[PDB]
Amino acid sequence: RPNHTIYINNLNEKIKKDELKKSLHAIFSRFGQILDILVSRSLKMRGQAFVIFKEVSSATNALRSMQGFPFYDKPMRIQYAKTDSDIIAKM
Ligand SMILES: [Mg+2]
Ligand SMILES: [Mg+2]
Numbered sequence: 001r002p003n004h005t006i007y008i009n010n011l012n013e014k015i016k017k018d019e020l021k022k023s024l025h026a027i028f029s030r031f032g033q034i035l036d037i038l039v040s041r042s043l044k045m046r047g048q049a050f051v052i053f054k055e056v057s058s059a060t061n062a063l064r065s066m067q068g069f070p071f072y073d074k075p076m077r078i079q080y081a082k083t084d085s086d087i088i089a090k091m
Pocket of ligand 1: 036037
C-alpha cells in the first residue's frame with residue numbers, strides 16, 4: 001500500500017488554506033522533493049490534506065517522522081493515500 005502520497009488528518013481547521021499549504025510545504029520538503037500539495041476548501045473544513053512526493057521513500061520517511069507532530073497545536077495523523085494520485089503518472 002505504500003505510495004508517493006500521504007494523507008494527513010486532524011489538521012487545525014482554523015488555519016487559512018493558503019498558510020496551511022505553505023506550512024505543509026516547509027515542513028515536508030525536508031523529506032524530499034514534493035510534486036504537489038492538495039488543500040481545497042472541502043479538505044480544509046475537514047482538516048485533511050495530501051502531499052505527493054516524487055519518490056516513495058520520501059513519503060515513507062515523512063509518515064514515520066511527522067506522525068503525531070503538533071502542527072498548529074494539533075497532533076498530525078498521517079497515512080498513505082488509498083490511491084496514489086494519478087498525478088504521478090501525469091507528472
Ligand atoms: Mg498544486
Ligand atoms: Mg515517529
